């Protein structure tokens, strides 16, 4: 068994929080290290975002 094909693959993601800037807008929010805002997706099932 010599031939060994290679296929690309992507793990889930990287959860390092990004840099945040202060725009002083009254209702702009930034989460904690592992925070997630819940929204209602188009299909109806809830989803998480930042």
């Amino acid at each position: 068994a010599t031939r060994t094909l290679v296929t690309a693959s992507t793990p889930g993601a990287d959860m390092t929080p990004g840099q945040l800037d202060y725009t002083s807008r009254p209702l702009d929010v930034a989460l904690q290290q592992d925070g997630w805002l819940v929204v209602q997706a188009a299909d109806g099932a809830e989803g998480y975002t930042r």
Binding site: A1, T2, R3, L5
Partner: protein
């Protein structure tokens, strides 16, 4: 029967060479199709059976796997094809020499 059998040995050898050539050409032309298994005939055993007598072809072991399931290897098939062609021409020359000698005896 005498002349018939004496020529028949080489005639059957030549026919077996031709059939093996046909099989080799088939499995070379079909060398780029998934799910195909390389086939060949045991020339020596087949000739021995025919001499005292619809051929029993058998699969060829692969040498390195391929995902699509192809087992025919082009280099080995080419070497076998060249060997078979040379054997066929050798048998043709021997048969022609025997026939020419037989004809020349009558002169």
């Amino acid at each position: 029967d005498r002349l018939d059998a004496a020529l028949r040995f080489q005639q059957e050898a030549l026919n077996l060479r031709a059939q093996r050539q046909e099989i080799l050409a088939a499995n070379i032309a079909n060398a780029d199709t998934p799910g195909y298994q390389a086939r060949d005939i045991d020339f020596a055993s087949e000739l021995k059976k025919v001499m005292v007598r619809a051929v029993d072809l058998l699969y060829r072991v692969p040498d390195q796997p391929s995902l699509d399931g192809n087992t025919v290897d082009m280099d080995r098939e080419r070497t076998q094809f060249a060997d078979n062609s040379l054997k066929y021409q050798m048998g043709l020359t021997v048969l022609g020499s025997q026939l020419k000698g037989m004809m020349n005896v009558l002169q």
